[PDB]
Design a protein around this ligand. Sequence first.
Ligand SMILES: [K+]
Ligand SMILES: [K+]
Ligand SMILES: [K+]
Ligand SMILES: [K+]
Ligand SMILES: [K+]
Ligand code: NA
Ligand code: NA
Ligand code: NA
Ligand code: NA
Ligand code: NA
Ligand code: NA
Ligand code: NA
Ligand code: NA
Ligand code: NA
Ligand code: NA
Ligand code: NA
Length: 191
Amino acid sequence: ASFTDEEDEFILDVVRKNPTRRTTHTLYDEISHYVPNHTGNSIRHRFRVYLSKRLEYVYEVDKFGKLVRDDDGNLIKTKVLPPSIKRKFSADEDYTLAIAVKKQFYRDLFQIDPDTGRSLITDEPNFAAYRTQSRRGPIAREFFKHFAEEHAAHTENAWRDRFRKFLLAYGIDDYISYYEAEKAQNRPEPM
DNA sequence: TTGGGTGGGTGGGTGGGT
Ligand SMILES: [K+]
Ligand SMILES: [K+]
Ligand SMILES: [K+]
Ligand SMILES: [K+]
Ligand SMILES: [K+]
Ligand code: NA
Ligand code: NA
Ligand code: NA
Ligand code: NA
Ligand code: NA
Ligand code: NA
Ligand code: NA
Ligand code: NA
Ligand code: NA
Ligand code: NA
Ligand code: NA
């Protein structure tokens, strides 16, 4: 659906009051709760392609991102954007995403559960010695929605682009082997 | 190995890249 002048100014006012959370997914999810028929990603695109063009200014915040006020308790306008504070991805989080995506490729390919070897109900090779190769595969939206429920540190959205932008570029097999090698008397760094 | 920003944001972000 479309955005009214009201929805547009509200989205702008919230981003100006939250400078450090402008590149997150969560801020737009929080905004969407107050905007009828719009998802968080719908609000995020609306800001990235249109509203960010006329941000004009943001409000002043401290090192923690909380709003700073004058001696009258009024907000202070500014044109200096503060650092985009975003939750980072650990090598462990990156691994679990590589393992989980390999497990889903396996299921979809061999119709055998990777964990037990049991057969699956649909509409043999070793998992460890299985290679996803160049497969980007078909992944349902439900995979990331369920994967965020298990790993709520990052949102389903955030997990989705970690796989498309980093995981698929670094290589699933490539990162799994890398993570394991460093695990033996070493510590692995995230993509 | 099937997109770009001179197509445009009143087309929309579950269509996808950026
Ligand atoms: K393309
Ligand atoms: K189009
Ligand atoms: K388009
Ligand atoms: K577009
Ligand atoms: K880019
Ligand atoms: Na829209
Ligand atoms: Na987005
Ligand atoms: Na966009
Ligand atoms: Na865009
Ligand atoms: Na074009
Ligand atoms: Na264009
Ligand atoms: Na244009
Ligand atoms: Na248009
Ligand atoms: Na539009
Ligand atoms: Na596309
Ligand atoms: Na997209």
